[PDB]
Design an enzyme around this catalytic site. Structure first.
Site, PDB file in Angstrom:
ATOM      1  N   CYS A 220      -7.022   2.444   1.501  1.00  0.00           N
ATOM      2  CA  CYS A 220      -8.141   1.824   0.801  1.00  0.00           C
ATOM      3  C   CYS A 220      -9.471   2.271   1.400  1.00  0.00           C
ATOM      4  O   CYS A 220     -10.446   1.520   1.399  1.00  0.00           O
ATOM      5  CB  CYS A 220      -8.027   0.300   0.861  1.00  0.00           C
ATOM      6  SG  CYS A 220      -8.619  -0.544  -0.623  1.00  0.00           S
TER       7      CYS A 220
ATOM      8  N   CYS B  92      -2.493  -2.732   0.737  1.00  0.00           N
ATOM      9  CA  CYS B  92      -2.745  -1.452   0.085  1.00  0.00           C
ATOM     10  C   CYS B  92      -2.467  -0.293   1.037  1.00  0.00           C
ATOM     11  O   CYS B  92      -1.631   0.566   0.758  1.00  0.00           O
ATOM     12  CB  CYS B  92      -4.189  -1.384  -0.413  1.00  0.00           C
ATOM     13  SG  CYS B  92      -4.866  -2.977  -0.936  1.00  0.00           S
TER      14      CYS B  92
END
Length: 122
Positions: A43, A40
């Site tokens: 995050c 990601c």
């Protein structure tokens, strides 16, 4: 303990991803899916932005999925692998953004969910 509240959902088996994608066409609101490869990225820095945004914008369903377990979803929208905030207005594809831009997200949600887009016009 959030047991999935009224914030940017976090699907992880399709079944959940649909629970939202479907609550947009009938509900009458735009769709905002936050894909992701596996890492990601932040995050954390924009964490309190997405989830908090989902609620801030009642004109959308919002939701986050993983393109590592149900990629089948990302492969349909063509995300490849990233925190792409793919959108599905009307139940198709309005556009995408990314889960790492605090200036590209709220900007897209306004054009799809805001129906006004507070960012230039022409």
């Amino acid at each position: 303990m959030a047991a999935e509240e009224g914030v940017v959902i976090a699907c992880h088996n399709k079944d959940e991803f649909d629970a939202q994608m479907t609550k947009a066409k009938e509900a009458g609101k735009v769709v905002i899916i936050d894909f992701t490869a596996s890492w990601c990225g932040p995050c954390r820095f924009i964490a309190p932005v997405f989830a908090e945004y989902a609620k801030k914008f009642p004109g959308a369903v919002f939701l986050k999925v993983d393109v590592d377990e149900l990629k089948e979803v990302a492969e349909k929208y063509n995300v490849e692998a990233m925190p792409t905030f793919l959108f599905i207005k009307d139940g198709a594809e309005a556009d995408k953004v990314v889960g790492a831009r605090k200036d590209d997200l709220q900007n897209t949600i306004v054009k799809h969910v805001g129906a006004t887009a507070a960012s230039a016009s022409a």
